[PDB]
A paper describes a structure:
The transcriptional activity of the HIFs is regulated in an oxygen dependent manner by 2-oxoglutarate (2OG) and ferrous iron dependent oxygenases which catalyze the post-translational hydroxylation of HIF-α subunits. Two proline-residues, Pro402 and Pro564 in human HIF-1α, in the N- and C-terminal regions of the oxygen-dependent degradation domains, termed NODD and CODD, respectively, of HIF-α isoforms are efficiently hydroxylated by the HIF prolyl hydroxylases (PHDs or EGLNs) under normoxic conditions. In a second 2OG oxygenase-mediated mechanism of HIF regulation, factor inhibiting HIF (FIH) regulates HIF transcriptional activity via 2OG dependent hydroxylation of an asparagine-residue in the C-terminal transcriptional activation domain (CTAD) of HIF-α isoforms; such reaction reduces binding of HIF to transcriptional co-activator proteins (CBP/p300), which are histone lysine acetyltransferases. Here we report studies that inform on the activities, mechanisms of action, and selectivities of the PHD inhibitors (and related compounds) in clinical trials for anaemia treatment, i.e. Vadadustat from Akebia Therapeutics currently in phase III, FG-4592 from FibroGen in phase III, GSK1278863 from GlaxoSmithKline in phase III, and Molidustat from Bayer in phase II.
Numbering used by the authors:
A (entry chain A), B (entry chain A): 15 to 349
The structure:
Amino acid sequence: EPREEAGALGPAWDESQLRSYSFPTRPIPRLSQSDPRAEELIENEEPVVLTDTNLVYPALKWDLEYLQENIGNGDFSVYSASTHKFLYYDEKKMANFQNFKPRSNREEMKFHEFVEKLQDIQQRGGEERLYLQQTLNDTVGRKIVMDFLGFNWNWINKQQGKRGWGQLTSNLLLIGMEGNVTPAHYDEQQNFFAQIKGYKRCILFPPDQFECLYPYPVHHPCDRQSQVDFDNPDYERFPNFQNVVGYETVVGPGDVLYIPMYWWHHIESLLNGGITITVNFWYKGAPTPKRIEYPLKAHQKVAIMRNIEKMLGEALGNPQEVGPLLNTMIKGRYN
Amino acid sequence: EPREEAGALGPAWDESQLRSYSFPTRPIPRLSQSDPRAEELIENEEPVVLTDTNLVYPALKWDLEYLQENIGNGDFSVYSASTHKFLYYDEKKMANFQNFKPRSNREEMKFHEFVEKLQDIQQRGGEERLYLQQTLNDTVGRKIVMDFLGFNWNWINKQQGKRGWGQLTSNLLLIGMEGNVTPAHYDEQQNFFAQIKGYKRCILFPPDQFECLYPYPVHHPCDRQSQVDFDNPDYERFPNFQNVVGYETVVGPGDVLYIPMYWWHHIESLLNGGITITVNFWYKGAPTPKRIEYPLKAHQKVAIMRNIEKMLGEALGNPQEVGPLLNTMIKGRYN
Ligand SMILES: O=c1c(-n2ccnn2)c[nH]n1-c1cc(N2CCOCC2)ncn1
Ligand SMILES: O=c1c(-n2ccnn2)c[nH]n1-c1cc(N2CCOCC2)ncn1
Ligand SMILES: [Zn+2]
Ligand SMILES: [Zn+2]
C-alpha cells in the first residue's frame, strides 16, 4: 500500500509504476532507527528500511540544477543502455569470454553534459536510458563537500562498530532515469542504501535462493548477476526460478535500506517517476569467527562455491575448463 | 592368441576361460626388459608386460604345500565373498555411509587353515570364494625370507631410481581361487605386478576414461572403485560406459605387468585355472615438478577432482553434503 505524502500532497506512487514479475514477494519492514526490532534485523543480517536516520539529510535538497551549480567541473562516469535493463560487467574478466557482447557502454563526461544529454533524450523520443554512477567525496565542489560532511556519520559509524564491520569501502552517488532497472545480483559487502530523490522499488532475495537465481560462472564478466531475464524467465534452463520468493519495498527520500551481505537485490526506478538520486554506503563485512560454528550460513556456502570455482580456474590454467571438469565430477557420481 | 607353453605342453589357456564383457580391448605389449620400447612405455607411464625380469624367480616354485611348510605359524588376512566379485572397502569410511552393506567379510587365520578352508570348498560345492592378501617380509618363515631376498632387487631398484619414484610402500602376496574377480579400480601408487602361479587376465583403462567408469564418491568406502557392474552395466545411470576401451593381457608365471599410477585395472583369475599366486610391488610416484607444465595430464585432473571432493567434505563438515552442493554449483550454470 503506497504511503501518503504529508500535507495531503497525494500518494507518493501507485502500483501502475511498478513492473510486473512472475514471483510472489512480501514487504520489507519500515521501522524507526530507535526501534529495537530494527537493530535485531540488522544484527541478524536481514533487510530493513529505516525511516528516520537523517543519514543524508543535507542531500535531500539535491536535484540536477543544484548538483550542476555545485558538484564541480570534474568528470563523472555515465553508463548507457538502449533498454531499461542496465547490463553491468567486469572489464577485467572479458578475456575469459570473447563471445560476450557488452550491452551497456560507459562514457566519462562533465556533469553539465550528463544533464544536457539527459535533457536531450527527454525532448526527443527516449528509448535510450542513462545512469550516473560516481564515487562521492572525490574532486567535488565545496558546497557538496559541506553536504557530504553533514551526513549522519554518528549513526552509521555506530552501526559499523556494533556489527563489527570493516571499513567504509565506497560512497557511491547514483542518478538514474525513470524506469531504469539494475537486474538482480548480489554483493559481497554490506550496504546502507540511502534514498534522496524519487522512488526505487527494491526486491531482495536471501542467499539461500542461490539455487533459484542461477548466477553466472564466477569467471564470467557478469559474475554475481542472475542469468534469469525477470521479464521473460526461461523455465526450461532455470526451472527453480518458479520457486523464487522476494522481499519487496519502495524507498523514497529520507529512507535507508539495509541490503545485507550476499542478499540478491533487483532495483528499479519507478516508471514515470522522474529521476532518482541515491547514495550507497558500502562496508566490508565483519571477519569470520575463529571457530566456524556449524551449521553454515547460506552465504558461507556461497563463499565456498565461489572459492571452488576460482580454485579450479587457477589449477586448470583456464576458466573455460571449469564447467567440463565439474560435470565430469558429478555425472553419474553425485547426481 | 594364447601362448604355447614350452616342451609342447599345450596352450597355457584358452578363450573359454575368460569372462565376457561389453567393451572392446587391445593388447598390452609383451616385451623383454632389455627392449628400449619397454623403458619408453614405463617412462611414459603406459602399461607393459615384461617377460624376463626374473623379478620373483625364487617364488616360481611356490604352491600351497610349499608355503604351508615354510611360511610360518603366523596369521594371514583372508577375504571372503559369496560371488566371484570381491567387494573391497575402506572400513575407516563406513561411518559416512551407514546404508553401505559389506559384501565381502575378512577373517584372520593361520595359513594351514586357509589351505583347509580352500580345500574344503573344493570337496564341497563352492559358490563361496576366497582371497589371501597379506603383506610380505613380515613374520615369515626363514625359507620364504630366503626366496624373498632372492627377488631381482637389482632390476626393480634401478626402475625405482630411473623413474624417480618414492619408496617401496608395500609388498603384497595374493593367493586366489579360480574365477576370482577384483573389480575395476585405480590406485594412487605405481605397481609392478609379478605373476607366480596360474593366470590372471588384466584389463586396464587409462586415467582419461574417468568419465566412462564412474568411481564412487571419494568419501564412500568404495572410493577409487568403479560403480559399474561389468557383468550387467546400467547404461541409463552410466551411459559413457558404452564408450570404454580397455588394454588387455593375460599374465602367467614369470611375467611382470606395470600398472601405472591412476590406471584403472580389472583383474580376474582364469576360470578353471586353479589357484593364482601373485606378488605386487607398490611404489610412491615421483613428486610433482616445481613448474606445473600445461596441459595437465589426465591423472592430475583426477587428483584435482579428488582434492575438491575432500575439501568440500571438510568445509561443509559433512561428506553427505558434497553432492547437493556440487549440483547447486553446476545446475543451470555450467551444464
Ligand atoms: O549500483 C548498485 C545498486 N543500486 C542502488 C540503487 N540503484 N542501484 C545496488 N548495488 N549496486 C552495485 C553497483 C556496482 N558497480 C560498481 C562499479 O561500477 C558500476 C556499479 N557493483 C555492485 N553493486
Ligand atoms: O589387490 C590388488 C590387485 N591385484 C593384483 C592381482 N590381483 N589383484 C591390484 N591392485 N590391488 C589393490 C589391493 C588393495 N588392498 C590393500 C588392502 O587390503 C585389501 C587390498 N588396494 C589397492 N589395490
Ligand atoms: Zn549491488
Ligand atoms: Zn589396485
